[PDB]
PDB file of C-alpha atoms (C1' of nucleotides) in Angstrom:
ATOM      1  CA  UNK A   1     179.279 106.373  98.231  1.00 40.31           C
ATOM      2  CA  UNK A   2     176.076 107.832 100.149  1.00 40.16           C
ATOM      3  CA  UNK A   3     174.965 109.976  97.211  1.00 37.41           C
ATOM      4  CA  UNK A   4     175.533 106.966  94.900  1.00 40.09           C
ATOM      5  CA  UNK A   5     173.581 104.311  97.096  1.00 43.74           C
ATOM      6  CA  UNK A   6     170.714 106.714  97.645  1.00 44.98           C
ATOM      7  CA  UNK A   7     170.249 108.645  94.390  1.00 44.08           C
ATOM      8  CA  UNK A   8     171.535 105.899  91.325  1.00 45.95           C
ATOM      9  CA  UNK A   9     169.920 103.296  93.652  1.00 44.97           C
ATOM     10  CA  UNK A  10     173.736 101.906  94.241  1.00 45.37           C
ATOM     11  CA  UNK A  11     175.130 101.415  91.187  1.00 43.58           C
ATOM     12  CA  UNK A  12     177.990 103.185  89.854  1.00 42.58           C
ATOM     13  CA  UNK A  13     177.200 103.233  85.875  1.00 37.90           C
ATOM     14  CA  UNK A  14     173.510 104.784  84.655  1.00 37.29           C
ATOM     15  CA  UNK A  15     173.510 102.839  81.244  1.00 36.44           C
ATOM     16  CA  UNK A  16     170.380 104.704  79.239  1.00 37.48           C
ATOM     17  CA  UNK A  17     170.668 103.709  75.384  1.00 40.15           C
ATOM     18  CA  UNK A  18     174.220 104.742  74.362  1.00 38.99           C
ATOM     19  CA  UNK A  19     174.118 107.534  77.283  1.00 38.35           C
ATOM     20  CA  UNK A  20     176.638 105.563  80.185  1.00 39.36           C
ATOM     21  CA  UNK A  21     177.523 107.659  83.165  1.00 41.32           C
ATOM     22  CA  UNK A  22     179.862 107.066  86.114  1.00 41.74           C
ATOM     23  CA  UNK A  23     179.041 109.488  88.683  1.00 41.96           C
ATOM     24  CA  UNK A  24     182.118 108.133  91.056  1.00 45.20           C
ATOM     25  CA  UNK A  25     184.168 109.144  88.143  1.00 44.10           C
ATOM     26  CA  UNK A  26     182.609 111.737  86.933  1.00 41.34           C
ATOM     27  CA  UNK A  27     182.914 110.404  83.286  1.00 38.19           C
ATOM     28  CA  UNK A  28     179.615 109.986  80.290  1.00 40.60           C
ATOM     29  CA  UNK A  29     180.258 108.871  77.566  1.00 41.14           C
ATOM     30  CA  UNK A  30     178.153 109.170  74.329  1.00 39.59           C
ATOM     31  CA  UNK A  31     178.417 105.579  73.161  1.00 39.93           C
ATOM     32  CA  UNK A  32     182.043 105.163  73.448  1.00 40.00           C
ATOM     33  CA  UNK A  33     183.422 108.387  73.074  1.00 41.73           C
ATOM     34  CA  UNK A  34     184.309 110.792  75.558  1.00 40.16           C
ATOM     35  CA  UNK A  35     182.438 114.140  76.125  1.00 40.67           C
ATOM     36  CA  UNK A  36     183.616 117.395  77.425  1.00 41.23           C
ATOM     37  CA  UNK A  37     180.753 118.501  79.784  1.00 39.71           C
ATOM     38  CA  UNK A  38     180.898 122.150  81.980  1.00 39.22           C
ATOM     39  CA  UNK A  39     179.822 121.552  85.259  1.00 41.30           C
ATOM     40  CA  UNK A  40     176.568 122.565  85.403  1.00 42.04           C
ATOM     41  CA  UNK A  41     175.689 120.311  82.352  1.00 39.70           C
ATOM     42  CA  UNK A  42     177.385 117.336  84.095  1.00 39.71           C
ATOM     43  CA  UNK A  43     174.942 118.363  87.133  1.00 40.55           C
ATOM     44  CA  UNK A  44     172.119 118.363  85.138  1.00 42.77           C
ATOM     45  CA  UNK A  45     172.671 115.502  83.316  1.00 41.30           C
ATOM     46  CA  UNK A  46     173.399 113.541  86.367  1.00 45.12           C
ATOM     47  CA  UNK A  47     169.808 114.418  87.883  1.00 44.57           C
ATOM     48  CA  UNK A  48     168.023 113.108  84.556  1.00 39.94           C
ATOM     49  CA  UNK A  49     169.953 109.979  84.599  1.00 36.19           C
ATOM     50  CA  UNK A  50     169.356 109.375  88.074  1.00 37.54           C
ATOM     51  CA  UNK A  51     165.608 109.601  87.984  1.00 37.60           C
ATOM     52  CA  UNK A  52     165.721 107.558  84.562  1.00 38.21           C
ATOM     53  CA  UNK A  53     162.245 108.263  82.725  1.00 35.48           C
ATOM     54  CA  UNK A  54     160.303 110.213  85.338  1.00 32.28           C
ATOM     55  CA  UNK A  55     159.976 114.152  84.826  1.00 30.73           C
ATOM     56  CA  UNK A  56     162.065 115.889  87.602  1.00 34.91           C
ATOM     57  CA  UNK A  57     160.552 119.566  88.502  1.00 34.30           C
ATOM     58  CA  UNK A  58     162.019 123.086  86.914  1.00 34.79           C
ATOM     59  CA  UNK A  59     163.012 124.068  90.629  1.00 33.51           C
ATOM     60  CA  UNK A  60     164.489 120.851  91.449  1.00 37.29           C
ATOM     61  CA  UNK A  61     167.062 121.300  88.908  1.00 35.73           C
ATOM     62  CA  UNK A  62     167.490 125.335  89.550  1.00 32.34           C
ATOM     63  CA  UNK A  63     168.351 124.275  93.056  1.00 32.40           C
ATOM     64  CA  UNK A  64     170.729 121.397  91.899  1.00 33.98           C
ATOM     65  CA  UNK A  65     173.045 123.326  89.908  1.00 30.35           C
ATOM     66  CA  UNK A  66     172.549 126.546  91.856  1.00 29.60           C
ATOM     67  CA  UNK A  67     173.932 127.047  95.413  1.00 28.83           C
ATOM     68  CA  UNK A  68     171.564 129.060  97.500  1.00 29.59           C
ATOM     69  CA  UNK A  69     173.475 131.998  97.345  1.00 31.49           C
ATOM     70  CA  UNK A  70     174.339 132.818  94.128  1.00 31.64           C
ATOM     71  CA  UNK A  71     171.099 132.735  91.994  1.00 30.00           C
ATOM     72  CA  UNK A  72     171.016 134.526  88.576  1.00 30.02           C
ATOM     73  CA  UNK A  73     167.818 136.693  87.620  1.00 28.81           C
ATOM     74  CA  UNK A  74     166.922 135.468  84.159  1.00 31.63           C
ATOM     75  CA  UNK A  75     166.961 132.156  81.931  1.00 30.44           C
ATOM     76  CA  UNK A  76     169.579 130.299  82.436  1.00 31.66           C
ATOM     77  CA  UNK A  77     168.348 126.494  82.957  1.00 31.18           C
ATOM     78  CA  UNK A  78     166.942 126.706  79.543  1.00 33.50           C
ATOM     79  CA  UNK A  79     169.944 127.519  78.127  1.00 31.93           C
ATOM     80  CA  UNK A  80     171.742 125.010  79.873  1.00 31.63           C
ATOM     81  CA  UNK A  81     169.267 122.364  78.558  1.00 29.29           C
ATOM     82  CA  UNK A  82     170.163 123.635  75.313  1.00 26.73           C
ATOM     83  CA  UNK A  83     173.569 123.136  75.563  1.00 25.93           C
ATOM     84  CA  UNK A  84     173.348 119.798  77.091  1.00 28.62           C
ATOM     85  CA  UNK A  85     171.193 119.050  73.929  1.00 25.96           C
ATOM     86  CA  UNK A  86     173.379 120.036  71.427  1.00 25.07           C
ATOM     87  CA  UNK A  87     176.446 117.877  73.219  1.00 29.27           C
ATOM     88  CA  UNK A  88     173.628 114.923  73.344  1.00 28.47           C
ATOM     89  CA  UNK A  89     170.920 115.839  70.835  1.00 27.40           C
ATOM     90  CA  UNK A  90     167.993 116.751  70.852  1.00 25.60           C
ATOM     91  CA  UNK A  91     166.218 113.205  71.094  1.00 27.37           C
ATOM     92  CA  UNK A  92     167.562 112.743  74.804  1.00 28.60           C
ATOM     93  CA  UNK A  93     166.289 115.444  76.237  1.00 30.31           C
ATOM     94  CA  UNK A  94     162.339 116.011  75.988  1.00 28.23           C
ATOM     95  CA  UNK A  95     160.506 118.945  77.206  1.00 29.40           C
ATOM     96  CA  UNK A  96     157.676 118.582  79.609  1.00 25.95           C
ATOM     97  CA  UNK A  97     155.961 122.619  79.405  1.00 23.41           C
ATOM     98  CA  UNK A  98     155.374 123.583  83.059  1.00 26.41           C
ATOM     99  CA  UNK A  99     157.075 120.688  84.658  1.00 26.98           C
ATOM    100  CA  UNK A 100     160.373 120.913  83.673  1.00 28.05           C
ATOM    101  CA  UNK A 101     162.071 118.386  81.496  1.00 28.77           C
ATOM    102  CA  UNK A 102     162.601 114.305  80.974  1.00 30.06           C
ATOM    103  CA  UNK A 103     165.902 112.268  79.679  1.00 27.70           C
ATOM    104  CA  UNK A 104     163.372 109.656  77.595  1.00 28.88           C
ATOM    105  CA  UNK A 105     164.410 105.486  77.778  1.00 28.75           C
ATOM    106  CA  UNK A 106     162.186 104.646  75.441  1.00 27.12           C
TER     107      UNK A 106
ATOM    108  C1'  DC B   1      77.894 164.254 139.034  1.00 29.83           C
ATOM    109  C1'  DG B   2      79.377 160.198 139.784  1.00 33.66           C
ATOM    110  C1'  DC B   3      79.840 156.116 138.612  1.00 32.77           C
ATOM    111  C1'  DC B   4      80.477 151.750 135.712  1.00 36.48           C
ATOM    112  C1'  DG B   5      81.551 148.177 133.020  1.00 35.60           C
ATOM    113  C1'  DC B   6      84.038 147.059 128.392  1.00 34.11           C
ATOM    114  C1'  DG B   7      88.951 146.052 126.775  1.00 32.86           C
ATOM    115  C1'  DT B   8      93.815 146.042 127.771  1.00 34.09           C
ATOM    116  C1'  DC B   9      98.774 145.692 128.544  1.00 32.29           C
ATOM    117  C1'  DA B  10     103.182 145.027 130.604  1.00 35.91           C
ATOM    118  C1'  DG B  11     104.093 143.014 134.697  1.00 38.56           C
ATOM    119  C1'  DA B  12     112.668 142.461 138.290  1.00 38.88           C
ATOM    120  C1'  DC B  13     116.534 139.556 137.783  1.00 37.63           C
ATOM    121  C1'  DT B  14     121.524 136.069 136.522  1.00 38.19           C
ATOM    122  C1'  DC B  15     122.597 131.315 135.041  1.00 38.61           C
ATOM    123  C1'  DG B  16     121.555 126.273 131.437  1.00 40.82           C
ATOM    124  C1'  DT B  17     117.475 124.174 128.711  1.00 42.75           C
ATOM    125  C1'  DA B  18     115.798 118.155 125.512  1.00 44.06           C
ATOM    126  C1'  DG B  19     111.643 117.648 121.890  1.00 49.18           C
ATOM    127  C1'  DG B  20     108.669 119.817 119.274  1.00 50.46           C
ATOM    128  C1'  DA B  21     102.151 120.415 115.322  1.00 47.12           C
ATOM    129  C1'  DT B  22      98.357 114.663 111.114  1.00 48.49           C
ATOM    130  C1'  DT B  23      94.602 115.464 107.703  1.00 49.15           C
ATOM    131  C1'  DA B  24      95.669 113.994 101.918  1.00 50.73           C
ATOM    132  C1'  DT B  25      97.693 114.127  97.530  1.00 49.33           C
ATOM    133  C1'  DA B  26      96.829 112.796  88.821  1.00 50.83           C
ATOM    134  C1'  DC B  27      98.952 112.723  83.731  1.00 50.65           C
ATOM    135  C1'  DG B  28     100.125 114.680  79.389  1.00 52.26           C
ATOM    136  C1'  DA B  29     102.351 118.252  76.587  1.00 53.25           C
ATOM    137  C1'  DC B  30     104.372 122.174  75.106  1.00 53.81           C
ATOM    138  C1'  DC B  31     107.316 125.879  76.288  1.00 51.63           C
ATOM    139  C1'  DT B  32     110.982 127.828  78.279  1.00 48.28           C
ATOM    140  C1'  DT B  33     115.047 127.948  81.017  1.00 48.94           C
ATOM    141  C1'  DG B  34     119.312 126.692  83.304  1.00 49.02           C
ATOM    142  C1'  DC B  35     123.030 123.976  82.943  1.00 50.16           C
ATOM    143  C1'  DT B  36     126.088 121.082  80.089  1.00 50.18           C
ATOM    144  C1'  DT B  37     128.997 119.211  75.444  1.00 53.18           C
ATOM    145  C1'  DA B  38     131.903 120.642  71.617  1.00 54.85           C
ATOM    146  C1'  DG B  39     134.786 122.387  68.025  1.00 57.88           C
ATOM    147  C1'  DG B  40     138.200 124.905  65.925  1.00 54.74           C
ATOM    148  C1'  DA B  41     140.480 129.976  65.790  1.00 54.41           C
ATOM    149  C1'  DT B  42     143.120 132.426  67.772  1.00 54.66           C
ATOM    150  C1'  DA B  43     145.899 134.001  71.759  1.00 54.96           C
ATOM    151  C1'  DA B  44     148.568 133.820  75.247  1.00 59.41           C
ATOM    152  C1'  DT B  45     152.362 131.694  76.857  1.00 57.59           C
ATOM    153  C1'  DA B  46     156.065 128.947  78.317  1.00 57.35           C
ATOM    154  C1'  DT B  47     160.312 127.317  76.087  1.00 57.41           C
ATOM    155  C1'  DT B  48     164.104 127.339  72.611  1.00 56.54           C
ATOM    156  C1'  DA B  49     167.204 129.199  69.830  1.00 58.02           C
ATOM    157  C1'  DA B  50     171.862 132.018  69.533  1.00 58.98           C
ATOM    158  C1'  DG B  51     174.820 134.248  69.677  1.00 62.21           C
ATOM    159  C1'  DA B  52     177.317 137.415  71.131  1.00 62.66           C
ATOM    160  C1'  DA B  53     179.299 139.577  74.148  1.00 62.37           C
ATOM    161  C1'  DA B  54     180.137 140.246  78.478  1.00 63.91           C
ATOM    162  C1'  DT B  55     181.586 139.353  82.141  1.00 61.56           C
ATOM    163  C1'  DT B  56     183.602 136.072  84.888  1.00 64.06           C
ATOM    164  C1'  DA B  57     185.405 132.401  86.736  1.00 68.40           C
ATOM    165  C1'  DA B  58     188.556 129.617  86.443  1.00 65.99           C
ATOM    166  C1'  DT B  59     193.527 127.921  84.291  1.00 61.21           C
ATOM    167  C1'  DA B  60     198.121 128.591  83.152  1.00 60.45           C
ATOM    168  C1'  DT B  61     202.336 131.828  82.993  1.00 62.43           C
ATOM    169  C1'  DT B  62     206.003 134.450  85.097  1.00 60.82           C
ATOM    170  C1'  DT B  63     207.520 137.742  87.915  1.00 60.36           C
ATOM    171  C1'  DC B  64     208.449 138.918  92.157  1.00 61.15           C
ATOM    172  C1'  DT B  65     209.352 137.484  96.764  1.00 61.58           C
TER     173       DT B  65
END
DNA sequence: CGCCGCGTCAGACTCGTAGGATTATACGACCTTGCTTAGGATAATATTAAGAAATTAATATTTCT
């Protein structure tokens, strides 16, 4: 509930074009179908969603999906971008060079 | 021999300490210089494939226990 009211402003649906996500339920759905999303895509997605149209920073997402502890030494964001893109395609997800990346409403 | 009159130069030491020197001022015209636009060709350079394989972290047996 605190996450939700702070973060998705307090709704519990992110409805961008055919993208819908309930992060209560954990569920998105690509139009109307189901997807099967790993965690760390379903993290990453989330954060886009949330901040609907604005850029969010390379090290805000490295932080979101990686606890303190346990952080990798090479690219691995990038290929989880990729990923995510090729469950969503490549439309959704824009690349901003140096400031991370952008889910685009428009 | 015994002045004698010219410049001449540093004169003890610790603390803070405001305002300070006018006059009266030509136009072009090259020529050069010292800094700014600008316009693409590359060159880094940040990211994206990709896959593949390698863990590797979970899922789901099944065998003990």
């Amino acid at each position: 509930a605190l996450l939700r009211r702070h973060n998705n402003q307090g709704d519990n649906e992110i409805s961008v074009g055919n993208l819908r996500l309930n992060v209560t339920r954990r569920l998105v759905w690509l139009g109307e179908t189901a997807l099967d999303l790993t965690p760390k895509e379903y993290a990453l997605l989330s954060r886009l969603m949330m901040k609907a149209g604005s850029p969010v920073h390379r090290e805000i997402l490295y932080n979101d999906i990686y606890s303190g502890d346990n952080e990798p030494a090479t690219n691995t964001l990038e290929v989880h971008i990729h990923n995510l893109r090729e469950k969503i395609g490549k439309s959704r997800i824009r690349t901003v060079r140096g400031f991370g990346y952008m889910l685009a409403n428009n």
